[PDB]
């Protein structure tokens, strides 16, 4: 549903943010 | 859910002026007795959060004004991220679940309904992966 | 009841943090969407509750420390207290009650259970003697 | 119990804060 969109694009966003960090500047990333 | 239409009386008001005095002392109290290893811990949720909320503006708020459109429960917002936050072990959707949640509670009413919405999805959202995230960070 | 006796993992401390941030994030927002009536009345429960706690600090003190020596539910608590404010119709009363909530919140590291209790002892406080009183002081 | 003298507590407080407001600023006290 609706939920399941929103988890969905909360993880996009999240990724993306990830992305945007300078490799290994966070152990995991 | 505009604030007004929650303060209709007299009673309305002072009632909720008690609710944010009692709320208040406490949290400000709180703060008051947190080791700077839990504050250290507040300021880096406030940066990332802000970052995120910065840089993706229109994407958190386009996922504000759908959650505005349809109705759904706590549980099953919680079990949706519980799901994303399996198989996602990014830092990302952890801090931009924790801005969603926030709004949502700015958006509740319920003071009772919002506490239980925020204890359960500080539960969700700290797990080991976030834990091991912060602890690097900080 | 002490803060570090709670906050003896990683994962306590980073729970914590999220809690925080939520809370202290729906409160600031709460007053800054405030109309100013409810903004005074604020003020008001601010300066009186001030007062009684300044001019009646040792009467105060021991029934925080009365309370801790007791286990008792937030139930009988509001009943003792509905009991009360049936037959005393005073302003002071009021204030008093709204103080020793307060402090028993702060003393409270359940935030659920923090946040039901002060909803019902609000609802118990604000009878329509309390509500004249602060609208004739406003 | 001692909820019950905590709360006379509280109502021995609340009066003696009331007589010290000289009478006629609030209504009701």
Same mark, same amino acid.
């Given at each position: 549903? @609706? @939920?399941?969109?929103? !988890?969905?694009?909360? !993880?996009? &966003?999240?990724?993306?943010?990830?992305?945007?960090?300078?490799?290994?500047? &966070?152990?995991?990333? | 859910?505009?604030?007004?239409?929650? $303060?209709?009386?007299?009673?309305?008001?002072?009632?909720?002026?008690? =609710?944010?005095?009692?709320?208040? =002392?406490?949290?400000?109290?709180?703060?008051? =007795?947190?080791?700077?290893?839990?504050?250290?811990?507040?300021?880096?949720?406030?940066?990332?959060?802000?970052? %995120?909320?910065?840089?993706?503006?229109?994407?958190?708020?386009?996922?504000?004004?759908?959650?505005?459109?349809?109705?759904?429960?706590?549980?099953?917002?919680?079990?949706? %991220?519980? +799901?994303?936050? $399996?198989?996602?072990?990014?830092?990302? %959707?952890?801090?931009?679940?924790? #801005?969603?949640?926030?709004?949502?509670?700015?958006?509740?009413?319920?003071? %009772?309904?919002?506490?239980?919405?925020?204890?359960?999805? #500080?539960?969700?959202?700290?797990?080991?992966?976030?834990?091991?995230?912060? +602890?690097?960070? #900080?």
């Amino acid at each position: 549903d @609706i @939920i399941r969109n929103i !988890a969905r694009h909360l !993880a996009q &966003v999240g990724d993306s943010m990830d992305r945007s960090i300078p490799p290994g500047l &966070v152990n995991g990333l | 859910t505009n604030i007004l239409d929650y $303060l209709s009386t007299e009673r309305d008001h002072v009632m909720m002026a008690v =609710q944010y005095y009692m709320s208040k =002392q406490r949290l400000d109290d709180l703060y008051r =007795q947190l080791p700077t290893k839990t504050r250290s811990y507040i300021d880096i949720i406030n940066m990332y959060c802000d970052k %995120v909320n910065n840089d993706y503006n229109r994407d958190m708020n386009i996922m504000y004004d759908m959650a505005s459109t349809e109705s759904f429960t706590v549980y099953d917002i919680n079990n949706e %991220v519980n +799901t994303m936050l $399996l198989d996602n072990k990014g830092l990302g %959707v952890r801090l931009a679940t924790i #801005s969603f949640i926030t709004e949502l509670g700015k958006r509740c009413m319920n003071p %009772v309904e919002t506490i239980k919405m925020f204890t359960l999805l #500080s539960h969700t959202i700290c797990d080991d992966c976030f834990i091991d995230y912060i +602890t690097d960070i #900080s």
